[PDB]
Design a protein around this ligand. Sequence first.
Ligand SMILES: *[C@@H]1O[C@H](CO)[C@@H](O[C@@H]2O[C@H](CO)[C@@H](O)[C@H](O)[C@H]2NC(C)=O)[C@H](O)[C@H]1NC(C)=O
Ligand SMILES: *[C@@H]1O[C@H](CO)[C@@H](O[C@@H]2O[C@H](CO)[C@@H](O)[C@H](O)[C@H]2NC(C)=O)[C@H](O)[C@H]1NC(C)=O
Ligand SMILES: *[C@@H]1O[C@H](CO)[C@@H](O[C@@H]2O[C@H](CO)[C@@H](O)[C@H](O)[C@H]2NC(C)=O)[C@H](O)[C@H]1NC(C)=O
Lengths: 48, 117, 49, 48
Amino acid sequence: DLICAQYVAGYKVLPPLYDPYMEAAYTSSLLGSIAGASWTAGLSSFAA
Amino acid sequence: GFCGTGTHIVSFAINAPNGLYFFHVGYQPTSHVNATAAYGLCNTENPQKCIAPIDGYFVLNQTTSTVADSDQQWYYTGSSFFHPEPITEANSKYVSMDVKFENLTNRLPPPLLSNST
Amino acid sequence: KCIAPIDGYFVLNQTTSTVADSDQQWYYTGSSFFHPEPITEANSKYVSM
Amino acid sequence: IPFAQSIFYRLNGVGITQQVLSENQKIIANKFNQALGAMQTGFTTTNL
Ligand SMILES: *[C@@H]1O[C@H](CO)[C@@H](O[C@@H]2O[C@H](CO)[C@@H](O)[C@H](O)[C@H]2NC(C)=O)[C@H](O)[C@H]1NC(C)=O
Ligand SMILES: *[C@@H]1O[C@H](CO)[C@@H](O[C@@H]2O[C@H](CO)[C@@H](O)[C@H](O)[C@H]2NC(C)=O)[C@H](O)[C@H]1NC(C)=O
Ligand SMILES: *[C@@H]1O[C@H](CO)[C@@H](O[C@@H]2O[C@H](CO)[C@@H](O)[C@H](O)[C@H]2NC(C)=O)[C@H](O)[C@H]1NC(C)=O
């Protein structure tokens, strides 16, 4: 009822910036990140 | 993520209207190389000694396509710039024995040799 | 071979004004209190040149 | 310690060895100099 009240009260619910396929790509890149080896200094090498 | 993106080198601060304005100079690499690394090296004696790198990698100087297991010498490289150099005790720790470590017979680094004269 | 300190400095025990390069012996000191002591392998790393 | 010597200790701390830093002093100094000359072209409305 507050979803169908946009057209009788005078407001609007705006869609989000990204669809659910973009935020499913954000958490799939978080699961398999390389993040080079954990005895090294720096953030510039990537050890698979 | 705190002081910009990448590896942080230095930052400067200047005055701005109603506050401060920061410049975060960081380190950005622009090319890469796929180097074959190792977890560590061990000799083949009893009791066994084993080493591991210090802030870097044990790599192979990939030049030709003929060097294999009698000329596969391992070098040390820093983790932020590829430049192979010899393995000494200035860049390697002693560690307890792992299974993923390479077993070496010849071409040992000086940490893995008989120090007794 | 080359060495470097561990959480401290390699300093000179500045006592007189006659010690120079044949008696300039280097000592180790902690970084938060000046008290020179001999350099052993308990307070120095090996480094590249 | 001077400013020029304490920059080379910050590059050695992130994983660049002393044999690379000694052979490439002038190149590193040039790349550092043409990043401070590019700060005064970033005061535009595209810069967020
Ligand atoms: C690793 O391999 C490189 C070759 O890819 C070696 O670099 C050569 O070094 C010699 C002598 O300094 C030069 O004459 C060559 O021009 C170099 N090659 C290149 C492509 O620049 C390097 O010496 C090797 N590293 C070690 C530790 O042996
Ligand atoms: C180096 O040699 C040792 C032998 O001591 C190898 O360790 C054995 O590894 C296999 C699997 O790789 C295990 O099933 C054995 O139990 C291990 N032996 C012992 C005594 O623990 C080691 O794998 C070798 N490393 C390489 C890279 O081949
Ligand atoms: C560094 O120099 C000081 C002197 O400034 C030395 O301290 C002296 O030590 C002797 C013997 O312990 C005492 O008799 C003196 O009284 C000390 N001097 C002072 C001013 O207290 C100290 O021994 C030197 N350090 C080393 C490692 O040789």
